[PDB]
Symmetry: D3
Subunit: 291 residues, 6 copies
């Protein structure tokens, strides 16, 4: 019953993803390939990271995550494959996902394979890891990889070997922690009783605005549900509401809701109306919150 959950920047407009899938079914006949998404901004490693960081607790143990934007395709770089440690706790977000009390996942139960370009930065931060290897063995990659298609050659193909039971430690040599490329995550700042961050994403298709200011940052400031907040975007577009659990708490349709999203980050929206689209709000815009 193996699963590969596949996240790329290949888009869905041509046969690129299908070539990868065909090879996945070829290598691992029993596999199920689940699309995460293929629409990320090409080469935006930070955005790709957002789409994969929270996946493990949702998937059956033993799932392989094939995650790739590969701007260094065709160079001497090689992918990294890592077995993560914890599926939740740090990335708990509530706790375990599923019905009842949720589904507890054993430690060391998920593998990610990716370009070694920092794509896995937040996965490693949130989940930790037990082992990491450079992906070099001709048992799991082509002897003559297509220079402009490493998302296929160096990620899709070896992910299928791993799903098929190829031993992780046999993909190539162990990588020391310092050899795993990471991106810098900008910290939430204090100024002086207010918290200053950024719009991390526009939540399509709804036009909700998500910031990088986390529940932990709020509860550190004595901010919880019911707190009257001022949330200023782009430095000049401000908004005022109490922090509420959900959209409908804003009352009438179109009213402003300030809430915590399902990943636990301070967010702003209109109730059953789009906030970002009419005002052309964008990721990267500053976001400041105060009580």
């Amino acid at each position: 019953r193996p699963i590969i959950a596949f996240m790329s920047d290949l888009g869905t407009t041509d046969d690129s993803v299908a070539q990868c899938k065909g090879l996945m079914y070829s290598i691992c006949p029993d596999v199920t390939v689940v699309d995460v998404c293929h629409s990320m901004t090409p080469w935006d490693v930070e955005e790709g990271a957002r789409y994969i960081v929270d996946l493990p607790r949702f998937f059956p143990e033993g799932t392989v995550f094939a995650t790739t934007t590969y701007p260094a395709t065709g160079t001497t770089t090689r992918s990294v494959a890592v077995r993560i440690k914890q599926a939740a706790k740090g990335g708990a977000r509530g706790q375990w996902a599923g019905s009842g009390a949720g589904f507890e996942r054993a430690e060391g139960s998920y593998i990610y394979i990716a370009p070694n370009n920092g794509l896995l930065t937040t996965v490693l931060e949130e989940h930790g890891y037990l082992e990491a290897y450079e992906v070099t063995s001709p048992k799991v990659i082509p002897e003559q990889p297509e220079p402009t298609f490493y998302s296929r050659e160096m990620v899709a193909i070896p992910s299928a070997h791993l799903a098929a039971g190829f031993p992780l430690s046999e993909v190539g040599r162990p990588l020391e922690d310092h050899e795993i490329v990471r991106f810098n995550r900008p910290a939430v700042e204090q100024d002086g009783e207010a918290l200053v961050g950024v719009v991390s994403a526009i939540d399509h298709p709804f036009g909700n605005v998500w910031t990088n200011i986390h529940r932990t940052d709020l509860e550190k400031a004595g901010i919880g549900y019911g707190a009257r907040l001022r949330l200023t975007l782009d430095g000049v577009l401000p908004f005022e509401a109490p922090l509420t659990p959900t959209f409908a708490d804003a009352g009438e349709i179109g009213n402003i809701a300030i809430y915590l999203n399902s990943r636990g980050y301070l967010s702003i929206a209109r109730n059953a109306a789009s906030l970002a689209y009419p005002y052309h709000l964008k990721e990267g815009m500053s976001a400041r919150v105060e009580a």
Copy 2:
């Protein structure tokens, strides 16, 4: 070989749909998840309804339809799960899908689970139902559901239990008919001998124009194939053509075809050219037809 057919407003730009799928495979390991679409206009319950109403006759018996736009997420509302009666929008004669004379489907062979917000209005009207229940059991939903993700908590999760053979009647208490929310469907009005309705959809990616004017409305004003029609749109733009079964009946490429769509509604198109896009025709525009 259980199937879940999954229709949401979650989009395909982030990991939202994948989180749902991971849980489906977690709960029902042998499941096949089939995407209906995830692109509907958020919170447009009437549009969501059109994408799900005619699904049962195409699917194997025992398929579960997980269908959701959930603007009331995080409120005290709970989903409804219903077993439908007739698979066909027909009866005796049926109009079954498939090769030869098509595949007849037994009655009571399909379950829908959806927010109780009217999404199922036309499914219930066209198909009838045998039983309906409120979805409240912690055996099939989380004890601590994520307030902003009821499409996952209250639809995806329980649909996978249902696919896995969890008894429908055990998801919660029976709902009386009046407790199942319905939307009103605006009637085609009669203006002299013209039928007056609306553009119900622009049929992407083709730019065909679908109206809410049914064959039955037409064959009550004296109109069948071959009839010379005048179809007026948005109160301004006029077209004239005989009613024909298909696009190529219009003759040359670009010529106007007035026809009945595969759902049996009065529609207008250009033959192998887009009608809607160059004239910026839109859903909700008035549509008037006369012989």
Copy 3:
């Protein structure tokens, strides 16, 4: 084990693709349906051809390719089903896909089913074929096909019977070569020294520019990796770079790379930046290359 790889112009915005998939699972319960793509420009048979021509070597033997844009839907036309000969564009060696030396695929191991409208022109040219039949038998198509949905009736449905092991030669009468509709492929011309073609596609989502000037055309001029080229787009844009294997060979981010894409065609891009989007370059613009 059977697989149907499905390429259509139906889009991903309504239930059209799902209706086809439901019927595929109905007819061939153990099938895996793999999406190629559903976003092609409607009725653009040359574009559809590009998404399907290179598929066979990526898929397990016995895979059925259901490939369809059907502007002649509802007419007396019938689909064609063909068994291809060679899975490669090559053979001597092969450039087989996969890890190690790749997966060699037996001859006669793939079936395409498509409208007989030229969609398979390049499939037939690159792979050859062993047999071809008109798709007419009520064992594999509806007795009463929906006039406006032949992509479902005349492609999806019979593809599932073929996947389930329905004998290919029983779908209908053999077709003679001349009865298989072909489109003309404009040839890459010569004057010089130089080579005059077109932009065949903008490679979404990256904005790379693909030409119809093939590596075999380049070989014909003794043009290889390292050669300083002038590539003029649209008649007035003399791009200059050496031919290199990949994007990063251009050096700095945003620099011009002239390269051979994974399909083997002369292409041009910027290194980890979009070439086509900022300057609105488009398919159909002229492309001239010289050393």
Copy 4:
């Protein structure tokens, strides 16, 4: 030295204004024609009114204002010509315009000629009038006016006769006050200590936002320069600044300025940056202000 100041909806893209001007120079050889503007939204009488209400104090005594949007062109309607009473005081706005203490204008010194469609509503409100006449005499309009060009026939042409010294009372019969069409001006409301109005205009080319909340309404509420204000636009986009005389009082470039515009209305802008354009703010959006 006569002047006609000319405001129309004819645009500047064809010869329409030039035909009018040629006739003006023909009728009144010594005249100077000054363009006010020709770009108003066609048929928007309220917008046209904004462009003409404040003109008299800027112009030499004896100036004729030819002001026209004529959606009733070619009907039995006839223009109105009015001599206004006061050039300023009510429409003082500071007081008199010009160097030193400004240029005092005698009463009864300006004539407007316009369609009788309410275009002059605010001119009459702010300035009063001494006499008003229907424009019917063949001495000042064509005997056979072009049905679709009353802006020329019934405004431009007679305005030139008036500039040339044709007696105002000879254009046709006197009009009683009730025969002069007026539009309704929505009042600024109180709720309960806040003032609720509308964005009256986006001030192009700067993207400043002008409201219909006047200095008089503010000083009625005890609001003056230095007051810390909250100005909420579109019901949800709020802004906070002190009321200042000018843009640069906001400090850094791009900072929000809340100010009184040169017509004396509460306005909001960014300092040397556009406010309206990045956020797509529009006329008609609600505007609420409170101290």
Copy 5:
């Protein structure tokens, strides 16, 4: 008293028009410069023609028309200066412009100066001409003309000398009729009964649709006011209305009016709403009319 009416493709976004005007005042101190328009599509001589053909009857006798789009700037080409014959399109009666019965204009009373590129084609056709000269004398053009600014050097400058009374016949040698470049005017054709032309212009800023089907073409078919017409735009839009004198005859706001515009051509619009803009109708689309 002299007047120069100035039509160019120079735009209103830089100092180009002002440079020409400065030179006009330098050469003819007492001149009045009247702008026709400066916004024509550059190099579109047929469009430029439309803005200048009807000017003479609106202006005092002796007016000089400086009219220019000059794509051949900087070549050996020289402008043409012509004295026109008839100020009208008529004569018998005349439909003179102005109050009363209008201002009759003497023959031979207007001069056009233009590039010899066909810009004056319709001026010559409708008005006739008495004399024409090549503009070559260094008394009226620069000895060293700016290569890229012949609209200034070869039109604006000599127009001012002509306005100042420089003898027309002294500008250079007489031109024979065949040396005056003309463009072809596509004829209004017949098949029926019906009349087949084109949309000649979208009438900005209103979005009315003007055709090249003239009142004299309509008279030829016995088509007059009151006739129930079908006007098909773009081949597929059979508009139906009676021919009426003006917009308001259509009744309700937004209703279709088919009318004769002030230039005498069959036109179509909505009553106080834009026809062309919502449906993106364009110049060059086919136009067919029948009764």
Copy 6:
């Protein structure tokens, strides 16, 4: 016959420019007001400068240039009024505008009045000046100037007094050279033997591309007419052509012309087609030229 040539950022969509003109005619009854343009990007002092720097040689002696973008409106700043020295950007030989050998203009024949914000930087550099004064006298500005309209109060009004013969030296105290604000003009840098500059403007309405690379920069790297050039734009888009005096030298319509504009700067265009618009070329993009 005094002239004021008027350049502002006020636009032509409301009554702002007309208010200024009315006051000009009020103060100087015999004045002619000539519009330069009113469309400049608000607050872009460098762009404003380009529209005014070469005006004097085209205008009669004694013309006053009223030139204004006033982002510091309502502050303690006051305008500067200067009498320039040389009318030509030349000296001996001069390069005079007009018919024959052009019209020589006496030294000290023109006055500019402008905000003291650097708008006059290039006027002063190219022309020199004889005297400069701060504009403060209540004889020429309002005692109570409208805070948000200094373009009217501190430019329009005093320019009309100056046109009327008010002694320049009486507007206020003399300004020392260091008190006249200047902007810095970025130099063309030298990279090997390539000249590196920028796109200074897109030349609307034509879509020609003007660079800041002067003939003098070129004829110092060894480039005159006939020289084969490579011009690279935005660091990506390449063009190649000989330097020619005009557009038609390129041959066929659409062919690339590299030329010197009427201001003597290196420019690039298509022959009677727009270059900038299809490729979305923009001001501020890098421009590099080499022989």
